[PDB]
Design a protein around this nucleic acid. Structure first.
Lengths: 51, 50, 50, 124
RNA sequence: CUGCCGAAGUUUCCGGAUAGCAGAAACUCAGAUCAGUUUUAUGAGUAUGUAAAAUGAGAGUUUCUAGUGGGCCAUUUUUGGUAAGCAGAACUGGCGAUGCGGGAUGAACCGAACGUGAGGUUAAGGUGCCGGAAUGUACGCUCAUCAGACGAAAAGGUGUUAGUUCAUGAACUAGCCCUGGGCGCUUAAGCGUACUACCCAUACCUCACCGUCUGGGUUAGCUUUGAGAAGCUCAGACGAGUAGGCAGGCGUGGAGGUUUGUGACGAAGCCUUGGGCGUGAGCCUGGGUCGAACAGCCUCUAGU
RNA sequence: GUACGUGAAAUUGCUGAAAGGGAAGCAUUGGAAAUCAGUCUUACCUGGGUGAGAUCAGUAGUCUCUCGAGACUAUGCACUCUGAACCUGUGGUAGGUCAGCAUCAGUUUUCGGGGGCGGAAAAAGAAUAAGGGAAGGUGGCGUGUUUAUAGCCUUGUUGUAAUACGUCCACUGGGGACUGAGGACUGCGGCUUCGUGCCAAGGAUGCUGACAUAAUGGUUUUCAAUGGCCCGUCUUGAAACACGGACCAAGGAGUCUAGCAUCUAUGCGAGUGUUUGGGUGAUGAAAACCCAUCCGCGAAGUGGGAACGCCCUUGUGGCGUGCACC
């Protein structure tokens, strides 16, 4: 048993064996849009742009 | 395992988003955010046995 | 953490370096702690569980 | 499992070429100051267990067979079940009369003979 | 011949009894302890110590039983110093039993500690040529007619580069230049800094193989037959080595047994740029020479 | 061929080949030259024809073993069998070194395409716009100006952004190199309505090409590149140094024995030990075999291994060897 070690990051068949979740993963989800509320008050900006 | 693995990944994403949102509100409002100090560390030995 | 346990992941089984090629290897050694897979092992390591 | 030799050169005794009184049969150097025992750079190699050959291919001739020493027709018939694993090698002191009898018997058994042409002539 | 284990190189009294280091045997023992380790806080005086937390490892033994009873390189702390060096304690490790990459070369400097190999990647050092690798990028100093690359030293510099202070100047500060491995190099192939590329160790990774150690499997011996159970099989880790210890083997003379063994159709020996086997001691074999005896296996023996 | 069996090494002469310039021999890797080794397609399968014979006879006898098992002897060649001989096939498959490619698996190196998420939700910038100054532009008179017939900076500000950097994708497309351990089946998985199903899932397979008078490698001599000190002893910190060594062959050093102790094996066991001696041994008789009387030595509370019965199991209860505690 286990004559050869196969890398789950390269062998996709070994990955499905070890992780029964990679089938439904959906890595790149989109959470941003064209209404991004830039959040940096004038107090913080003044401190940052100080001296 | 499929349900547990899915739960773990959602936990990581929620925690990562929580840090981003909390820092965003601290930056915008005016105070400062101090995230939790690390609890897990990876050590690599770089010197030989001599 | 995730890639280390996958590519370079080995477990101490009967004082032997047995690679974690199957979830049954992890369960047979950490089943008493409700760790049954590599993702449970990753979750325990990354989040520093009990 | 093809035959692999970790080394083909022999291990010659140190200073065996310099002196005719010193044979080339390997002798482990005992001098503490000797650079060969200390295994310096450029010096000759020493027999180590790492040089040992594969157990499966050990004792195997380049054709994959193991030499089995044979002195009469009784020894050839022994390789009936092992003609794919062993080759018959007639001893050096077996006369040319017995060598002929061995060679004909080995031919029917399908047994390779390493020195089947020694001490004999052919006449077709 | 190979394999495995492996020191001490010095406390204490005083040629030894020791101890200690390294092995064997007889044990018991994880619901237990141990540690060239860090802690918690308070006890005492940041250090030091404490009982009970973290990390790692299963540990404690009792008996006897080989070898050693020095030094060197020195570092550091450190005492006295004394023209000045230097010497004196402890401490620290290394060399001593240790090969390898670098250091132009190198017994003690920088890396790294070793089974046989393939591939990859590095360390210390390096990439003008010798020499494997950018005559790479960016920003600066210097032109040395004794450059630089590795005390005559105080100063002198109508030698400078930048800056600081006071303020037309004055000095000051810091750094380069002068006076006091080879070839060659000069907006460098020198020096300083930053940044990517690249070179390669016996080191690191992956794989194969050798061996040792450790753990596991294997009998109503199942048509998987793989029960020389002293066999077969699975797995993981490891590999320097002096003294010393322990295993397994190779070879020689003779003896008991055995091969219903080899031999004048050529024994033994010898020669040979013939062939093969074994990590090795060694063994088998072709040809030549030669002319009467000789060998394998099990055991015994020794003027081996 | 009496300088006489075999005829080693050191050493010498001649001949042949090769290399020559000073540490050298030697080690590693290949070239060249010389030489050598083994590996071959041949068989297998199938069909018919012809004859054959026995382990075949809707067959007769003998022998040896334990009805039938072997060996034969006659007689037949169909019924079966003999891949049996040959003709017929010109049927079909065809084994060892090299080489090439393709599908893969392991390791690794090297370019590229996208997509999320972070930062001042990048900063800039294009761009809406108010003001100001000069490295004063343009006008005005080198001096001073404030957009003129350039514009610059600052500021809020125009629809939002984009990009860079960091990070992630169980997103994706190529190139190169090394490796192929194992050897029926099991297992974990993915596809698949299910599948003696298929698969990149407990380690390489498939498709081809070249050669026997050759291909491929080995050996020897030499060359090239890289490295490389002379051993043994003694010394001391390792050294160094000083000792031994012209060469070759043969000989040449922990042996035998008497005690003692340890460990192991073997026999017997409160015993044990035949061999001072006697008996005996017909064939070799210094052996082996047998033993009368003496004698030597020896002797005269807990923990806990293992097992039983209960307890879902742990655990409890009864019973404890050896040894250490009491």
């Amino acid at each position: 048993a286990h004559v050869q070690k196969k890398n789950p990051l390269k062998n996709k068949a070994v990955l499905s064996r070890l992780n029964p979740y990679a089938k439904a993963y959906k890595a790149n989800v989109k959470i941003n849009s064209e209404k991004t509320p830039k959040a940096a008050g004038e107090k913080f900006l003044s401190v940052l742009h100080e001296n | 395992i499929a349900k547990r693995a899915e739960a773990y990944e959602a936990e990581y994403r929620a925690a990562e988003r929580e840090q981003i949102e909390l820092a965003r509100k601290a930056r915008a409002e005016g105070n400062y955010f101090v995230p939790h100090e690390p609890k897990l560390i990876f050590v690599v030995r770089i010197r030989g046995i001599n | 953490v995730r890639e280390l346990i996958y590519k370079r992941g080995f477990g101490k089984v009967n004082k032997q370096r047995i690679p974690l090629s199957d979830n049954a290897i992890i369960e047979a050694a950490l089943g008493k702690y409700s760790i049954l897979s590599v993702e449970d092992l990753i979750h325990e390591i990354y989040t520093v569980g009990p | 499992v093809n035959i692999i030799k970790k080394r083909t050169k022999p291990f010659k005794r140190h200073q065996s070429d310099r002196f005719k009184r010193v044979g080339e049969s390997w002798r482990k150097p005992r001098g503490i100051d000797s650079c060969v025992r200390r295994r310096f750079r450029g010096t000759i190699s020493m027999p180590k267990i790492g040089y040992g050959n594969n157990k499966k291919t050990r004792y195997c001739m380049p054709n994959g067979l193991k030499a089995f020493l044979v002195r009469n027709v009784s020894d050839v018939e022994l390789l009936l079940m092992h003609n794919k694993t062993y080759a018959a090698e007639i001893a050096g002191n077996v006369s040319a009369r017995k060598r002929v009898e061995i060679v004909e018997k080995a031919r029917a058994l399908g047994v390779k003979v390493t020195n089947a042409g020694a001490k004999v002539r052919s006449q077709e």
